[PDB]
A paper describes a structure:
[name] (X-linked inhibitor of apoptosis) directly inhibits the upstream caspase-9 and the downstream caspase-3 and caspase-7, and therefore controls critical apoptotic checkpoints. The [name] protein consists of several domains, including three zinc-containing [name] (baculovirus IAP repeat) domains (BIR1, [name] and BIR3) and a C-terminal RING domain. The linker region blocks the active sites of these caspases, while the N-terminal regions of the partially processed caspase-3 and caspase-7 bind the [name] domain in a peptide-binding groove that accommodates the four N-­terminal residues. As has been reported previously for other [name] domains, the overall architecture of the [name] domain is a three-stranded antiparallel β-sheet surrounded by five α-helices, with a structurally important zinc residue coordinated by Cys200, Cys203, His220 and Cys227.
The most potent tetrapeptide among those assayed against [name] is [name], which interestingly was inactive against BIR3 in our assay. In fact, all peptides with alanine at the P3 position were essentially inactive against BIR3. Therefore, the structures of [name] [name] with five different peptides soaked in and bound to the Smac binding groove were also solved: [name], AVPI, SVPI, AIAV and AMRV. As in all described [name]-domain structures, the P1 alanine points to the face of Trp210, which creates the bottom face of the pocket. The N-terminal amino group is anchored by several hydrogen bonds to the surrounding acidic residues Asp214 and Glu219. Arg222, which is poorly resolved in the apo structure, is well resolved in the peptide-bound structure, bending in towards the binding groove to interact with Glu219 and His223. P2 makes standard backbone-to-backbone hydrogen-bond interactions with [name], and the side chain points towards solvent. The only interactions are hydrophobic ones with the side chains of Asn209 and Lys208, perhaps leading to the weak preference of [name] for hydrophobic residues at P2 (see the AMRV structure), but explaining the general lack of strong preferences for this residue. The P3 alanine is rotated so as to sit along the hydrophobic surface of the protein, and the P4 alanine points into a small pocket created by the side chains of Lys206, Lys208 and Gln197, although Gln197 can rotate away to make a deeper pocket, as will be shown later. Finally, the P4 backbone NH donates a hydrogen bond to the backbone of Lys206.
Numbering used by the authors:
A (entry chain B): 1 to 4
B (entry chain A): 151 to 233
């Protein structure tokens, strides 16, 4: 995942 | 106290689990797994947020686990560090  | 959750209302795992009512069908991680790692659904896309540190995670990939993504991105989170 990516830090949003 | 000396720490404070970004979202006290999501302090509860059951409250976090309920937030996934409209989790999208393409999002492969389970509400069970995500809520257990401190995360609740923000209502946008596959974007979740941690009740404790307030970090947000989206665009999940196959093989991603909720706890390891949480710890990778937000290693200083008190929920991560209290686990
Ligand atoms: Zn966190």
């Amino acid at each position: 995942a990516t830090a949003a | 106290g000396t720490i404070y959750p970004r979202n006290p209302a999501m302090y509860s795992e059951e409250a976090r689990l309920k937030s996934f009512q409209n989790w999208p069908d393409y999002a492969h991680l389970t509400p069970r797994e995500l809520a257990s790692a401190g995360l609740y659904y923000t209502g946008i896309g596959d974007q979740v947020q941690c009740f404790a540190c307030g970090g947000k995670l989206k665009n999940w990939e196959p093989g991603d686990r909720a706890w390891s993504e949480h710890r990778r991105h937000f290693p200083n989170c008190f929920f991560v560090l209290g686990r």
